[PDB]
Design a protein around this ligand. Structure first.
Ligand SMILES: Cc1cc2nc3c(=O)[nH]c(=O)nc-3n(C[C@H](O)[C@H](O)[C@H](O)COP(=O)(O)O)c2cc1C
Ligand SMILES: Cc1cc2nc3c(=O)[nH]c(=O)nc-3n(C[C@H](O)[C@H](O)[C@H](O)COP(=O)(O)O)c2cc1C
Ligand SMILES: COCCOC(=O)/C(=N\O)C(C)=O
Ligand SMILES: COCCOC(=O)/C(=N\O)C(C)=O
Lengths: 361, 359
């Protein structure tokens, strides 16, 4: 089974090709994680996945999506991740973390508490920042403040400091959140970036914030641990061929800048789109990025059945299959996948106190 | 769906009829639970089950099954359970604990490490105690020492101390482990109890250790929290009608002694048996105990599909359905069952950070 072959990237070996992508839990307080996350992450790691990327973790307070988002903007915040890192490793999984800045989508309610921008009369809200003073629209109407050059320098240093903190906490895999309409994606997209300085306009200028952040992070992140990023390569906004071509070119530049693997996603930069949701729909797009940028890839959004994951790997569309919601439904999804694919001794995807009994059941 | 109706017993209300029965993890050291158990129990409780009974927890060191068994024989051992209790309650489930003494089956290797008695020359082992000096046999050949009258008084006091500690640690449900061939079951069974004193021979004498332990625990366990026991009601040893009849009479005496619910199981007292394993096979036996002894019951051993669990409740065979191994495979099994049975807003069997997205 291709899904259960190990994978080596830099000095890190994953025991299989199942990755748990970052999934915000909205359960932190002032950026500090707690027993919600400790159990959540430890249980999924014991489930058998080879790589667990911790949820979008804000590099600065205003870069959280919501008041429940995790943060890593101080050393105290980083120390809180140490028992999570250690529990993921104790389970035989590899701990990774996505470091993030929500941009114009920041200062929002939790998804089950309105999912919308916080009202200006609510004491929990804060001022958002973005490349240009333009609102996402729809349920996110708040207009962000347009960043100055000093803001750009500051946010880049925040990504650097966060990467250094993640390193010292023991994470073995880092993912820069350049996707999903948050800060990084919004610098790249012409929908959200109307700047007239060095950080907007041309392809080189729109790419600049992302390349400079990657390069600044590369100086502090160890050469022997995977340096990755998530990036929305198209928007389904009627501009897909031109946008995908530009995104693939940016992926080539990421590779030239030391990126080890790209998590290929959708932009979500604006609401006026027509995303063709369906099983494994990102397969052909991830395959094109992988082949044309010559970089390992993962993807998500509908690979969460054992046969779809297996087929994507056998077709060389992906190097790792990210399975998100199926792990919220069943933290032991990797064991379920091993049974479905007929892995020898599939119960031993789990630790002994479970594996011994499910072998004979 | 009957499986998702709440259940009230004494002052305790379970949010559904799914119970996670005690399941030894063999991951403790010197009786102390640790990060294995914390995550294991918290994750299953978040999965949606209404009641989570923590694994067999030894009332005394020699009462552990293996060197990896949990214990509650000191206040420090009890304090280690406090974060497990808090995490189960935080998930909206009810925390219970099974207090236990392994008797002649004690001093054994972990199941994935031979599953057999530790050799008498191996320093990891210890001397075992039982009603009589007679071995289980097969992979458990070690002959226990027959308990003295002082041993009997001490072990009863150990059960009392364990119940007091479980109470003070915040458990809302207690289960005395009188099943599965361990100490309590071995006092009741004529296979293992050859005593000639007040604790063996007649039905009254074989019942005595179990009834006296229940009465002693009743003194320290709050009246407003369910007091339960697990008990093997037959052996599949060719003596089933006579054994079942006597076991139901003992269950009537448990009820008279304040027992609130009986977990109905198989005795496993000796190896020379023919247990007819199959889907929901305990259903008819649990129903007979429930109806004849007029006690609420749970049972296990093959109810772990949503339709089998629902059928057993609808047929009034059980009041709670215990689902064990399916929860080791999938800690969120209660959510899987809610979807299968068409529960309205089934994803909200889980907490919000999962439920919102699975809807
Ligand atoms: C609750 C939840 C939280 C998520 N959080 C993040 C996140 O923090 N960062 C990110 O890049 N993607 C996030 N995602 C998107 C997932 O990583 C993944 O791409 C998506 O769930 C699709 O994969 P799936 O079909 O296997 O669930 C999240 C998704 C969900 C459902
Ligand atoms: C790993 C494991 C540990 C168990 N530990 C206990 C225990 O500590 N006390 C007990 O009474 N039963 C114990 N049992 C028996 C279960 O509680 C339950 O009766 C059995 O698993 C059958 O139910 P199921 O078919 O839903 O798994 C254990 C079973 C397993 C597989
Ligand atoms: C509609 O947005 C889909 C893409 O955004 C995400 O997946 C995410 N973080 O990256 C969330 C929702 O927290
Ligand atoms: C052969 O299985 C006997 C039944 O005994 C149990 O279920 C148990 N504790 O009660 C274990 C195995 O720890």
């Amino acid at each position: 089974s291709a899904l259960f072959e190990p994978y080596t990237l830099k000095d890190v070996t994953l025991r299989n090709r199942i990755a748990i992508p970052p999934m915000c839990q909205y359960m932190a307080e002032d950026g500090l994680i707690n027993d919600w996350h400790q159990v959540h992450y430890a249980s999924m790691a014991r489930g058998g996945a080879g790589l667990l990327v911790v949820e979008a973790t804000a590099v600065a307070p205003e870069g959280r999506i919501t008041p429940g988002c995790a943060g890593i903007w101080s050393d105290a915040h980083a120390q809180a991740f140490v028992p999570v890192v250690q529990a993921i490793k104790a389970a035989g999984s590899v701990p990774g973390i996505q470091i993030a800045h929500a941009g114009r989508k920041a200062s929002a309610n939790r998804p089950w508490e309105g999912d919308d921008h916080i009202g200006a009369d609510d004491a929990r809200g804060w001022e958002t920042i973005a490349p240009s003073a333009i609102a996402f629209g729809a349920h996110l109407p708040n207009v962000p403040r347009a960043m100055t050059l000093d803001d750009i320098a500051r946010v880049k240093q925040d990504f650097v400091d966060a990467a250094r903190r993640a390193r010292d906490a023991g994470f073995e895999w880092i993912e820069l959140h350049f996707a999903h309409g948050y800060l990084g994606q919004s610098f790249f997209s012409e929908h959200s970036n109307k700047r007239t300085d060095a950080y907007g306009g041309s392809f080189d200028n729109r790419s600049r914030f992302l390349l400079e952040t990657l390069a600044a992070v590369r100086e502090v992140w160890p050469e022997n641990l995977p340096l990755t990023a998530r990036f929305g390569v198209l928007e389904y906004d009627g501009r897909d061929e031109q946008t995908l071509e530009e995104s693939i070119e940016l992926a080539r530049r990421f590779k030239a800048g030391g990126l080890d693997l790209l998590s290929v996603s959708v932009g979500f930069t604006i609401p006026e789109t027509n995303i063709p949701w369906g099983p494994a729909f990102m397969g052909p797009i991830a395959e094109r990025v992988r082949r044309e940028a010559k970089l390992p890839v993962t993807s998500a959004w509908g690979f969460g059945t054992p046969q779809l994951a297996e087929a994507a790997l056998q077709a060389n569309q992906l190097d790792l299959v990210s399975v998100g919601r199926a792990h919220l439904a069943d933290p032991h999804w990797a064991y379920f996948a091993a049974k479905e694919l007929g892995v020898e001794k599939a119960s031993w995807t789990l630790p002994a106190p479970y594996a011994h009994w499910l072998e004979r059941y």
